Every structure is written in structure tokens, then in C-alpha cells.
Design a protein around this ligand. Structure first.
Ligand SMILES: C[C@]12CCC(=O)C=C1CC[C@@H]1[C@@H]2[C@@H](O)C[C@]2(C=O)[C@@H](C(=O)CO)CC[C@@H]12
Lengths: 34, 339
């Protein structure tokens, strides 16, 4: 009964388990942005 | 885990993020913190005195608890770890230096560059700027498997050296989306405005989950096959700026420690591709990295003389999110002229 809907700006943080490196960090304010 | 390197590199990531959003608050953000950290660490190998200490502090190293040699060894070990062979996930990071043939380089610099950063030295004729630009961009295009094609847009004909870092990442979801469940849906730019996007969906998923009621946001961790995963942070409507102001290593650690497995009935995630390119000069100055750009620049660890200065640091990154997984690449260049 839990819904998680990414239909508004969100953050993405791609991480490595081994090194704890942040490979990529992103804010998606508009997937179709110029 | 290298706790010291990870703490500096994570502090640096969030400090860079905040400056990028301050500079362009309405734009998508996508960058590779570890690419920029490694490129600037590579630069500091040749730096001395205030130029050096600004770079290392700007990278968020505590110089009262670590030394330059330890920092470089930590990056050497990071590059070795990231580039180890894998059957599950594609990950590659490379460094290169493009140098005017006639420029006299210290033997200890070129040797340390190869030993610590895996960097070769490519003789480059910058006076033929078109060909020099093409060489650097091809190196980056090769390293990112075609994804980053135009990292260098303009190149001064009087450039002496360019340091380049790239990162290439391609990974499959542990629990991939079925494209038959992807449907055009609204993505709300604001409470009153939206765009239509392909919305992917997963059903009956058990994943790590945390509702951060104090910060008005929801955090989930999705897994890739291999040793990578992704924290998704979903602020409630109109609360993105409030979450961004709380971004830090402490918050990320707390989020990580607060995640609990929860059965999710439905998870909806857009399929999207975004890219950004950055002139990092103003951001690096805001972070305290100043002398490297000035007439007082001290890069005498490269040549033996204070005859080089940074002109520009650039970064470009691309992020593709789709049903099977994620592809992301980025590259950083440090352009250097005579002084
Ligand atoms: C946030 C964290 C600690 C603070 C820091 O500097 C950088 C990071 C990013 C990677 C994070 C770690 C840490 O939380 C442990 C992990 C997440 O919680 C691992 C787990 O999922 C727990 O088993 C996989 C990814 C890890």
C-alpha cells in the first residue's frame, strides 16, 4: 500500500559500495529540459 | 574503504552541488564529483605553496590530518579499485595529459603522473588548435564509449597543457523495469505545469526506504548488479530547495543509516536522458581555488619554474535512465597556459 512516484523534481546519487565514491550526482528538474 | 578520501570527496560533491544550483537554480544538474576531484587532485600534483594548499583544501581535505603524498596515494588506490575488471558492471576512469612537445616537464612530474594517476603524456600541437581539440575530444569519446563527444569546445592556440579525466559507467538494474509497463505520464515541473514523459514502473518491490518527515522527502535505494547503487531523493512538492540546503555528508550518512526494507506497491520512475556542460571557473573560485588562475599561480612542480597557470576547468556529464539500467559518463579538463 506504499507508492513512490517520481513525477516531480528529484535527486539521484549514484554510489560505489567499495569506495563510497559518488560517481554521479543529479537533479532532475525537467526530464525534457533544453 | 578509504574513510579519509571518501569523506573529502563526499564533502566536495555536496559543496559543488550547492554552488551549481546557486548558479543555475532552474536547471537540471548532472555531474561526476569523483571525476572533478580526481582531475583537481591530478592538477595539485604539480602545484606548490598557496596554489597547492588552496586546491587540497578546496577538495575538502583536512591538511592538519593528512599530507599531499597520502592524498595522491589515496587517489592512486581509488583509480586501481575503480578500474578492476568486472563481469557485472562497466566502470572505467582514465586520466591523460596533452602537452606541447617543446614544453620542458620535470621527470618526477611525468613519472608521478603515470604512477599515481595512470596518466600518459601525449605530445600535442596546440597551435593547430583544431587538431589538438580533436585529439582530446577523441580521447574522451573513446573513454566514454561515444557518450561525451565535445568536452573541449574552444582551445586557445597558446595552450601549454590539458589534463583530462573521464568516467564511464554502464549498469543493469538488479530489478529491471518491463518496457510494457512504461506509459506516457505527467512530470510536474511545478504545482501547475507539467511535461509528458515515459514513466517506467515496477510493481511489488521490496527495497530500502526511508520517509524523512523532518526534511519532507522520501529516500529509496535502487540497486545495480555489481557494487553500485543509487540513492533517489524525492522531496515533496515545492520542497526541493529545502532538501538541497540540507545536503551534506552527514545527511547522506543519516539517510543511509535510516533506510529500512519496505514492500512498495508501485514505483514510478521516468525514462530520461539529460546532459549538462559546465565552466567550473567561478565555482572553483567560490570554493577557494584562486591562485591557480592568477599571475601568482605556482605550478612549478610541473616544469621547475612558475611558468604555467590554469585558464579554465570544464566538465560535461550525461545521464541515461531506462528500463534495463543506467548509462552515465562525464569528463573534466584543466586547460593550462604559459605564465
Ligand atoms: C552513505 C555512505 C556513508 C557516508 C559516505 O561518506 C558515503 C556513503 C555513500 C555510499 C553508502 C555509504 C553508507 O551509508 C553505506 C552504504 C549505504 O548506506 C551501503 C549500504 O547500503 C549499507 O549496507 C551501500 C552504499 C553505501
Amino acid at each position: 500500500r506504499t507508492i513512490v512516484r517520481f513525477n516531480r523534481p528529484f535527486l539521484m546519487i549514484i554510489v560505489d559500495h567499495f569506495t563510497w565514491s559518488i560517481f554521479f550526482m543529479s537533479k532532475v528538474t525537467n526530464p525534457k529540459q533544453a | 574503504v578509504d574513510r579519509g578520501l571518501a569523506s573529502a570527496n563526499v564533502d566536495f560533491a555536496f559543496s559543488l552541488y550547492k554552488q551549481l544550483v546557486l548558479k543555475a537554480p532552474d536547471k537540471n544538474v548532472i555531474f561526476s564529483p569523483v571525476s572533478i576531484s580526481t582531475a583537481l587532485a591530478f592538477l595539485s600534483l604539480g602545484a606548490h605553496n598557496t596554489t597547492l594548499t588552496e586546491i587540497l583544501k578546496g577538495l575538502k581535505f583536512n591538511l592538519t590530518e593528512t599530507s599531499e603524498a597520502e592524498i595522491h596515494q589515496s587517489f592512486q588506490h581509488l583509480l586501481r579499485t575503480l578500474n578492476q575488471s568486472s563481469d557485472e558492471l562497466q566502470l572505467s576512469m582514465g586520466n591523460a595529459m596533452f602537452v606541447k612537445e617543446q614544453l620542458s616537464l620535470l621527470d618526477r612530474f611525468t613519472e608521478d603522473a603515470k604512477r599515481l594517476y595512470g596518466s600518459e603524456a601525449f605530445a600535442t600541437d596546440f597551435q593547430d588548435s583544431a587538431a589538438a581539440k580533436k585529439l582530446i575530444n577523441d580521447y574522451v569519446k573513446n573513454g566514454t564509449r561515444g557518450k561525451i563527444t565535445d568536452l573541449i569546445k574552444d582551445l586557445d592556440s597558446q595552450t601549454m597543457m590539458v589534463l583530462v579525466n573521464y568516467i564511464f559507467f554502464k549498469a543493469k538494474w538488479e530489478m529491471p523495469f518491463d518496457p510494457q509497463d512504461t506509459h506516457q505520464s505527467r512530470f510536474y515541473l511545478s504545482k501547475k505545469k507539467w511535461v509528458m514523459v515515459p514513466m517506467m514502473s515496477l510493481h511489488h518491490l521490496t527495497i530500502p526506504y526511508f520517509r524523512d518527515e523532518e526534511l519532507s522527502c522520501t529516500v529509496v535505494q535502487l540497486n545495480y548488479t555489481g557494487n553500485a547503487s543509487v540513492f533517489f531523493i524525492l522531496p515533496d512538492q515545492d520542497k526541493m530547495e529545502e532538501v538541497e540546503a540540507m545536503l551534506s555528508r552527514e545527511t547522506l550518512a543519516r539517510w543511509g543509516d535510516s533506510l529500512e526494507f519496505r514492500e512498495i506497491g508501485e514505483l514510478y520512475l521516468p525514462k530520461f536522458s539529460i546532459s549538462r556542460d559546465y565552466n567550473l571557473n567561478d565555482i572553483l573560485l567560490q570554493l577557494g581555488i584562486e591562485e591557480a588562475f592568477t599571475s601568482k599561480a605556482d605550478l612549478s612542480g610541473i616544469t621547475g619554474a612558475r611558468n604555467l597557470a590554469v585558464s579554465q576547468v570544464v566538465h560535461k556529464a550525461v545521464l541515461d535512465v531506462f528500463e534495463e539500467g543506467t548509462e552515465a559518463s562525464a569528463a573534466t579538463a584543466v586547460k593550462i597556459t604559459l605564465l
